[PDB]
Design a protein around this ligand. Structure first.
Ligand SMILES: [Zn+2]
Lengths: 100, 10, 273
């Protein structure tokens, strides 16, 4: 057995401009086994209309998945990705950092 | 296209 | 440049929850073009790229028949492996298989591969000569002997050096517009203070394709070790990546970020200015 904890990145598809439609992404990679819970949150509430890529894996057999949702950023809306995996003592919530 | 040969149980 | 075609298969047992999950995906370079998911509605191989949609019903019927056969083999494998390792029926286990071929700039066969993993670790793989196997441990030696007796390698070799390459060329031609393209990265830098004495310089590469790229930070012409994130998909067929370094405020000019990508005439040098 091997267990690898997920690396998680939260970002937009195109540079973010308030008032302009875009896509919010939560990319989870480097994990094993494949069972993983991923939810995108808007002001702390789960977003239902989220799509995800077909499970695939890297050269070291670790898995990666992209979860994404269409959204229009605003100044007040806070977004985050919630991930749970067997390697985490508790779910990890990663906020979308718009200032990098 | 997928392999049609060489895929056998371990 | 060079090109590759790869098929990735993942099978996961679901103790007390019935049949194992089976997911198969096909890629040409960094572009996915087909998928099959045991939990999806169609129960068929499905297209995921516009250029593969033109293939006819014979192609889809054939691919669906073969992916189901792959599924069936992996279903048996899960039970066999649990047996080889005398593992309980309580836990979920994972089998992963990857195979495919690479061709050079002239689109001629370069290398082939067929690798198999159990629970995230190498289990057995075909060697680069495509005529012998590397078994990870004692249990895998049993499969190695079985596959040698059955001449599995010569069969995979025929596929990897022939069929695999022939179809990769066909796909490259049919999807020329999107597969034989390079999108140079759009680059920039950001600068943010970490404290009154330090600042983070982040070098960004966006909207590039293919995924392969190298971002390096140099201080007065010498490589630095810096934070790098894994290259990530934008969701529109391109990729993104950034690299950052923490520098003493006032010394920003001692740093340069270098970007290399096949879509770039020559490597780029960025500086905070
Ligand atoms: Zn800023």
């Amino acid at each position: 057995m091997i267990q690898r904890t997920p690396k998680i990145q939260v970002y937009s598809r195109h540079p973010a401009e308030n008032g302009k439609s875009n896509f919010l992404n939560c990319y989870v990679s480097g994990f094993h086994p494949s069972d993983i819970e991923v939810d995108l949150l808007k002001n702390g509430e789960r977003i239902e209309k989220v799509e995800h890529s077909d499970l695939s894996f890297s050269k070291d057999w670790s898995f990666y998945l992209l979860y994404y949702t269409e959204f229009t950023p605003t100044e007040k809306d806070e977004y985050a990705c919630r991930v749970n995996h067997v390697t985490l003592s508790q779910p990890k919530i990663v906020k979308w950092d718009r200032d990098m | 296209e997928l392999a049609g040969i060489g895929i056998l149980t371990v | 440049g060079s090109h590759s075609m790869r098929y990735f298969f993942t099978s996961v047992s679901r103790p007390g929850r019935g049949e194992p999950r089976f997911i198969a995906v096909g890629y040409v370079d960094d572009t996915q073009f087909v998928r099959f998911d045991s939990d999806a509605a169609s129960q068929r191989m499905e297209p995921r790229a516009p250029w593969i949609e033109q293939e006819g019903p014979e192609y889809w019927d054939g691919e669906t028949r073969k992916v189901k056969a792959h599924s069936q083999t992996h279903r048996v494998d899960l039970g066999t492996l649990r047996g080889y390792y005398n593992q309980s029926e309580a836990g979920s286990h994972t089998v992963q298989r990857m195979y495919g071929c690479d061709v050079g700039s002239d689109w001629r066969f370069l290398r082939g591969y067929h690798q198999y993993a159990y629970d995230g670790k190498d289990y057995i793989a075909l060697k680069e000569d495509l005529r012998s196997w590397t078994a990870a441990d004692m249990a895998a030696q049993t499969t190695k002997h079985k596959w040698e007796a059955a001449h599995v390698a010569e069969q995979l070799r025929a596929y990897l050096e022939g069929t695999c390459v022939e179809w990769l060329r066909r796909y490259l031609e049919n999807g020329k517009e999107t597969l034989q393209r390079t999108d140079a990265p759009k680059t920039h830098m950001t600068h943010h203070a970490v404290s009154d004495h330090e600042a983070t310089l982040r070098c960004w590469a966006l909207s590039f394709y293919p995924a392969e790229i190298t971002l390096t930070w140099q201080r007065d012409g010498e490589d630095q070790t810096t934070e790098l994130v894994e290259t990530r998909p934008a969701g529109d067929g391109t990729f993104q990546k950034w690299a950052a370094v923490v520098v003493p405020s006032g010394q920003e000019q001692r740093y340069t970020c270098h970007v290399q990508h096949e879509g770039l005439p020559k490597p780029l040098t960025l500086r905070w200015e």
